[PDB]
Write an enzyme that holds these catalytic residues in place. Structure first.
Site, PDB file in Angstrom:
ATOM      1  N   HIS A 246      16.253   6.760   1.673  1.00  0.00           N
ATOM      2  CA  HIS A 246      17.252   6.944   0.620  1.00  0.00           C
ATOM      3  C   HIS A 246      18.428   5.956   0.738  1.00  0.00           C
ATOM      4  CE1 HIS A 246      19.229  10.240   3.116  1.00  0.00           C
ATOM      5  NE2 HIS A 246      20.242   9.411   2.897  1.00  0.00           N
TER       6      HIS A 246
ATOM      7  N   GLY B  73      27.431   9.812   5.599  1.00  0.00           N
ATOM      8  CA  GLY B  73      27.396   8.686   6.522  1.00  0.00           C
ATOM      9  C   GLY B  73      26.581   8.985   7.774  1.00  0.00           C
TER      10      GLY B  73
ATOM     11  N   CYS C 249      23.468  10.214   7.944  1.00  0.00           N
ATOM     12  CA  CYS C 249      22.036  10.020   7.784  1.00  0.00           C
ATOM     13  C   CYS C 249      21.492   8.933   8.683  1.00  0.00           C
ATOM     14  CB  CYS C 249      21.676   9.796   6.324  1.00  0.00           C
ATOM     15  SG  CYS C 249      22.178  11.160   5.256  1.00  0.00           S
TER      16      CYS C 249
HETATM   17  C1  LIG Z   1      26.227  14.170   1.992  1.00  0.00           C
HETATM   18  C2  LIG Z   1      25.605  14.530   3.317  1.00  0.00           C
HETATM   19  C3  LIG Z   1      26.288  15.339   4.218  1.00  0.00           C
HETATM   20  C4  LIG Z   1      25.682  15.704   5.404  1.00  0.00           C
HETATM   21  N1  LIG Z   1      24.449  15.321   5.752  1.00  0.00           N
HETATM   22  C5  LIG Z   1      23.788  14.532   4.900  1.00  0.00           C
HETATM   23  C6  LIG Z   1      24.309  14.107   3.676  1.00  0.00           C
HETATM   24  N2  LIG Z   1      23.544  13.309   2.787  1.00  0.00           N
HETATM   25  C7  LIG Z   1      22.629  13.777   1.908  1.00  0.00           C
HETATM   26  O1  LIG Z   1      22.453  14.971   1.681  1.00  0.00           O
HETATM   27  C8  LIG Z   1      21.800  12.700   1.222  1.00  0.00           C
HETATM   28  C9  LIG Z   1      21.872  12.725  -0.315  1.00  0.00           C
HETATM   29  C10 LIG Z   1      20.990  11.728  -1.027  1.00  0.00           C
HETATM   30  C11 LIG Z   1      21.173  10.315  -1.019  1.00  0.00           C
HETATM   31  C12 LIG Z   1      20.212   9.625  -1.742  1.00  0.00           C
HETATM   32  S1  LIG Z   1      19.083  10.704  -2.410  1.00  0.00           S
HETATM   33  C13 LIG Z   1      19.881  12.073  -1.754  1.00  0.00           C
HETATM   34  N3  LIG Z   1      23.281  12.759  -0.786  1.00  0.00           N
HETATM   35  C14 LIG Z   1      24.063  11.535  -0.544  1.00  0.00           C
HETATM   36  C15 LIG Z   1      25.560  11.774  -0.760  1.00  0.00           C
HETATM   37  C16 LIG Z   1      25.834  12.339  -2.143  1.00  0.00           C
HETATM   38  O2  LIG Z   1      27.213  12.719  -2.258  1.00  0.00           O
HETATM   39  C17 LIG Z   1      24.941  13.528  -2.454  1.00  0.00           C
HETATM   40  C18 LIG Z   1      23.469  13.212  -2.173  1.00  0.00           C
END
Ligand SMILES: Cc1ccncc1NC(=O)C[C@H](c1ccsc1)N1CCC(O)CC1
Ligand SMILES: Cc1ccncc1NC(=O)C[C@H](c1ccsc1)N1CCC(O)CC1
Lengths: 304, 304
Positions: free
Chosen positions: A41, A143, A145
């Site tokens: 992603h 950040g 990930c």
């Molecule tokens: C935000 C976060 C917090 C803690 N652990 C992980 C994350 N990131 C995600 O869940 C990834 C997701 C994604 C990106 C590409 S397809 C899906 N995500 C990006 C950030 C965005 O604000 C909302 C979706």
């Protein structure tokens, strides 16, 4: 003396963390030999996070679009491929700090350490368990990930998890190092509800044995039970069923303490039925399930 | 999302751990620059652990009696001295992995990470706090002496603790890196009882703010209190008195959540008076006090 939620020393894994940037997204990568592993992603845009077609998005990307930085020095990307939900960036330099390693897919109930990272830099280490619903209750912000979960056996790091998603309920989902998600989770911004978070019964028993080894013995009772009787109680309290395999794995703890597994099950049965009555066990007011029988033996014996 | 008891990445400290042997006793040493720090009780015999005279015992020791091994290679000891309850072994080689470092003496309430070691090899990392009675509730077995506690500020390791003793009650005592014990503890096999283990009030408040930031809000009430009223309740429950200094340090968490410190004190007051009623906060059934306001800010912001 004492019993703590202990993580593996993170040094071997800190030497693998790198920063991966694609366009405007920056996340973490794991650099092992001449390959950097990161969540696919990283290639996604904000206007297409609902239904991304990763094969199609990857067509618009070239080796020079993946910016990999190890410390303050840039790595040269000479190849890129997608394996399930992870990208593998072939770099021109083998990581000089590559530890001996394996990639393992863990089962629910198994514990591991997470080295939380931001911008390829480690922020902290904590101990986790793969929940029975295939989520992990981590501590991750945007950040994080690409941060990884792992176990260590002397000099070999077994990587088991790579952080990918935060579910709308604040729990976490990710993949093994082959890019396969644990559970039914997908790397897209969609409604993904987690199943029942049941308690890892074998781990609770192991932790009760650790409590006995460390002097907390108030909960020991004059009773015993059977696997079938215990499992009726476990089902009622959303505890995982106890199998003879679990009984066998608890064998060393049963042998050390002289407390038969089924007697410890009866103690656990009374704790489920009566509660703790304002009392604590190993400084906890609830039954801890994120220590496996192996973790208890390791901590109680001092394995390095 | 999520909140975990998180330790600092241990890599910088793992590169400092060495094994120190004197006669038949082997424990851990901390190798920084050309000096190895270790507990002076490494020189003690079993028949004189009750009342050792360390100056007298040290007279019978020479540089060649201290065996220092870093990995599988032996370090040459060219000098030795005693500073309070630690020995300083001058070696002929500066540790090539010496991180930027400081030695700090912490105050009760402050948290730190412990890298538990055996035979100079790291076994695990966990988060600790200097209790108000100057003990630490660690996880240490025989052979763990010389394991250290530390905090990290970007690239600088502030060493604050070195493990020395296990009290008859299974709690731990040790020194700062200048050899001065925290609390009144002495390095001898004598009756040493710990004082009241009171709760670190400012840390509980910081952890309640972390709970609010992460969505656990059930405990928030419609009340407020004063520092004096709160402190009467805190005294009754063996909680440390809350000062205006503590209120000031909680300022950033108060500002982020919009919950005034005295309102959070009133919530804590009701939790002390009524209990949790079988409910949990950040997966705990008790009030956690081993997160400082700094730790909460750090974890909730993602500092590396
Ligand atoms: C935000 C976060 C917090 C803690 N652990 C992980 C994350 N990131 C995600 O869940 C990834 C997701 C994604 C990106 C590409 S397809 C899906 N995500 C990006 C950030 C965005 O604000 C909302 C979706
Ligand atoms: C045993 C242990 C477990 C966990 N953390 C630390 C320790 N070690 C001690 O308490 C040191 C002590 C000592 C040695 C020299 S003067 C006093 N200790 C040596 C071991 C011995 O069995 C009984 C005295």
């Amino acid at each position: 003396s004492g019993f703590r939620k202990m993580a593996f020393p993170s040094g071997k894994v800190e030497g693998c963390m790198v920063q991966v940037t694609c366009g405007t997204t920056t996340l973490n990568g794991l650099w092992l030999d001449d390959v950097v592993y990161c969540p696919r992603h990283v290639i996604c845009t904000s206007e297409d996070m609902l239904n991304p077609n990763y094969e199609d998005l990857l067509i618009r990307k070239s080796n020079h679009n993946f910016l990999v930085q190890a410390g303050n020095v840039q790595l040269r990307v000479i190849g890129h491929s997608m394996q399930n939900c992870v990208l593998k960036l072939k770099v021109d330099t083998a990581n000089p700090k590559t530890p001996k390693y394996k990639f393992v897919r863990i089962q629910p109930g198994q514990t591991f350490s997470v080295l939380a990272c931001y911008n390829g830099s480690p922020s902290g280490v904590y101990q986790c368990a793969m929940r029975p619903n295939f989520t992990i209750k981590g501590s991750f912000l945007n950040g994080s990930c690409g941060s990884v979960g792992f176990n260590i056996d002397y000099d070999c790091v077994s990587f088991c998890y790579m952080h990918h998603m935060e579910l709308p309920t604040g729990v976490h989902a990710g993949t093994d190092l082959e890019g396969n998600f644990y559970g039914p989770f997908v790397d897209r911004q969609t409604a993904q509800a987690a199943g029942t978070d049941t308690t890892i019964t074998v781990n609770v028993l192991a932790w009760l044995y650790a409590a006995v080894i460390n002097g907390d013995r108030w909960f020991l009772n004059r009773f015993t039970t059977t696997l079938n009787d215990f499992n009726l109680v476990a089902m009622k309290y959303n505890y995982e069923p106890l199998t003879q395999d679990h009984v066998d794995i608890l064998g060393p703890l049963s042998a050390q303490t002289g407390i038969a597994v089924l007697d410890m099950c009866a103690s656990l049965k009374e704790l489920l039925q009566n509660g703790m009555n304002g009392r604590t066990i190993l400084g906890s007011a609830l039954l801890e399930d994120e220590f496996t029988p192996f973790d208890v033996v390791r901590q109680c014996s001092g394995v390095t």
